[PDB]
Swiss-Prot record:
Superkingdom as given in the UniProt entry: Eukaryota
Family of this protein: Belongs to the FNBP1 family.
Record-annotated REM-1 domain positions: 17-94
UniProt name for this protein: Formin-binding protein 1-like
Role, per record: Required to coordinate membrane tubulation with reorganization of the actin cytoskeleton during endocytosis. Promotes cdc42-induced actin polymerization by activating the wasl-waspip complex, the predominant form of wasl/n-wasp in cells. Essential for autophagy of intracellular bacterial pathogens.
Domain notes: The F-BAR domain binds the phospholipid membrane with its concave surface. The end-to-end polymerization of dimers of these domains provides a curved surface that fits best membranes with around 600 A diameter, and may drive tubulation.
Location of this fragment in the whole protein: 330 to 426 of 550
Quaternary structure, from the entry: Homodimerizes, the dimers can polymerize end-to-end to form filamentous structures. Interacts with GTP-bound cdc42 and wasl/n-wasp.
Localization (cell): Cytoplasm; Cytoplasm, Cytoskeleton; Cytoplasm, Cell cortex; Cytoplasmic vesicle
Coiled coil residues, start to end: 12-104
Encoding gene (name): fnbp1l
Amino acid sequence: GPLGSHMKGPALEDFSHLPPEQRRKRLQQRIDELSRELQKEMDQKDALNKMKDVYEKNPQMGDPSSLHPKIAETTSNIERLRMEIHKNEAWLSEVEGKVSQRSE
């Protein structure tokens, strides 16, 4: 089944198996991790872009093309982490719209 929740290990695209209130609490914690993780990668990219420039202005360091895989993967992790923030926010859009567990 294409909709059989084919998730990549710890990368859950669900969090629905727990109730909205408990859910959003974990979503906030997930966003916490991902945003803090992303902060590293975003900085890492700028560092790599800076580093690349150093390799360009001063080949003393080495070859800038050897840093192309660096920037590529670094940016890929940036996208990866950011979209994982988005998925959480997407669920929050639902969860925070229905914080009540229906009627009593």
